[PDB]
Structures are given as C-alpha cells and as structure tokens.
C-alpha cells in the first residue's frame, strides 16, 4: 500500500566512469511511511 | 445514517463514478478522471 525506502552509503575507492563497484553490500531499511499513492513514472531532481 | 445524513433537505454532495477504463487497485483511489473525446464521431455532440 505505501512506499518503502532502503539506503546505504559506500566509500568508493575505484575508478568512477565505465565502472560499477564490484562487491556485496546489503541496504538496510531507513524510512517507510503510509502514503497510498499511485505511481507510474518518476523523475530525478538534479 | 437515514436520520443523520438524509434529512429535511438532503445532503446531495455525495458523488459517485460510473465509467472508467482503469479500474481500482487494492487500496487505491482515482481523485479526478479525464473525460475527453473518446468517440471518433465526425459530428461533435451527436444525439444518443
């Protein structure tokens, strides 16, 4: 019924372009608030 | 609620829908439909 949010930060030491950091890191739940929202698309905010 | 809501004049502010192509999901509500020219009639506003 609502939106779940998981997040974790990582101190990257590897090359930034043409690379995703290889390794394992589980993301802990941070916030989860009861909003009954219909969601079809989304957009970032830079 | 026939003695509380329904009264001497009647509260006619209770609207309800009848036509939609996107039906309801579990715990989901459409707040405003978008009714446009869905029919492809040449004469706009045909009788019937």
Swiss-Prot record, chain A:
Superkingdom to which the source organism belongs: Viruses
Outcome after substituting residue 38 to Q: Increased resistance to neutralizing antibodies
Residues bearing carbohydrate: 38
UniProt effect for mutating residue 12 to V: In strain: Omicron/BA.2.75
Function, in words: Attaches the virion to the cell membrane by interacting with host receptor, initiating the infection. The major receptor is host ACE2. When S2/S2' has been cleaved, binding to the receptor triggers direct fusion at the cell membrane. When S2/S2' has not been cleaved, binding to the receptor results in internalization of the virus by endocytosis using host TFRC and GRM2 and leading to fusion of the virion membrane with the host endosomal membrane. Alternatively, may use NRP1/NRP2 and integrin as entry receptors.
Subunit structure: Binds to host ACE2. RBD also interacts with the N-linked glycan on 'Asn-90' of ACE2. Cleavage of S generates a polybasic C-terminal sequence on S1 that binds to host Neuropilin-1 (NRP1) and Neuropilin-2 (NRP2) receptors. Interacts with host integrin alpha-5/beta-1 (ITGA5:ITGB1) and with ACE2 in complex with integrin alpha-5/beta-1 (ITGA5:ITGB1). May interact via cytoplasmic c-terminus with M protein. May interact (via N-terminus) with host bilirubin and biliverdin, thereby preventing antibody binding to the SARS-CoV-2 spike NTD via an allosteric mechanism.
Name by which UniProt lists this protein: Spike protein S1
Gene field: S
Stretch of the intact protein here: 199 to 242 of 1273
């Amino acid at each position: 019924g609502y939106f779940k949010i998981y997040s974790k930060h990582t101190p990257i030491i590897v090359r930034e372009p043409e690379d995703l950091p290889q390794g394992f890191s589980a993301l802990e739940p941070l916030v989860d608030l009861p909003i009954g929202i219909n969601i079809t698309r989304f957009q970032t905010l830079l | 609620s026939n003695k509380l809501d329904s009264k001497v004049s009647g509260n006619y502010n209770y609207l309800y829908r009848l036509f939609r192509k996107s039906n309801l999901k579990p715990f989901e509500r459409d707040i405003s439909t978008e009714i446009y020219q869905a029919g492809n009639k040449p004469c706009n506003g045909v009788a019937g």
